[PDB]
Amino acid sequence: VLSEGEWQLVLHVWAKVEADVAGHGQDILIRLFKSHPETLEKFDRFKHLKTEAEMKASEDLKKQGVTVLTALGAILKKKGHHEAELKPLAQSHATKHKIPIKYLEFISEAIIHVLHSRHPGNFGADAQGAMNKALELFRKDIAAKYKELGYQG
Template sequence: MSDFDTVLASWGKVESNISGLGGEVLTRLFTEHPDTQQLFPKFTGIARGDLAGNAAVADHGKTVLIKLGEIIKAKGSSDTIKPLATTHANKHKIGLNNFNLITEVIIKLFGEKGIWDAAAQDALRKVMASVVNEIGCVYKQLGFAG
């Protein structure tokens, strides 16, 4: 079974609560890595204590997980990754390390919630290493130092 298939085997658990989990992912990201909150201009004015349960944070977290699901379902296809990488370089100016940070937050949170066992967590780590590498290649083509 490929790493993509390992992650997909339990992706339904993520989709069943994608908005709630998305909000938790971003809340945890902003709490554990406070500097990342500044990368999201619409969230900069939200106090850390007000992140959990914030509808806008949950909505954007849902978007993040939907896009992650699309990438996983497409098995890391360049056709799926390139548009994301392009907007994250040209518009959002998101450095590559931030993809690694959110990956670890997702792995930790989903492990704590029993969504992913150790094998699925390891599989996502491998999948995202490949995805981040692909994003880095696009960044290089675009001349973004991210």
């Protein structure tokens, strides 16, 4: 359980993300695909992309990044009261896309990397700790849902 102050650190950096969600989404998905290339193979619309430049030029990848961060943002703004938001997301990621918990770990690492890079004004150690806690809670609750749904994450 996060404290109110931890949530405030999370939502303060998120507010900066929201200044340019598309840009942040591109940076995060690209960081994930560079750092863990195997994760790209899960995306049929753009698994063929070969380079970061191609990735930056991809309107579809940009749209996907927006879709991811907007969904995540809505979850974060619930401050742990996110059961309703998690149901469809867990179902799709378990059953349609087959995304292991390990890969949700990888994207969380990518989120933290980009925020650290872009937002040192809002992402010092305490803020990064709070964001890590929020993302650990997300993964914990999604992992419990995966189990309910029948998916070894």
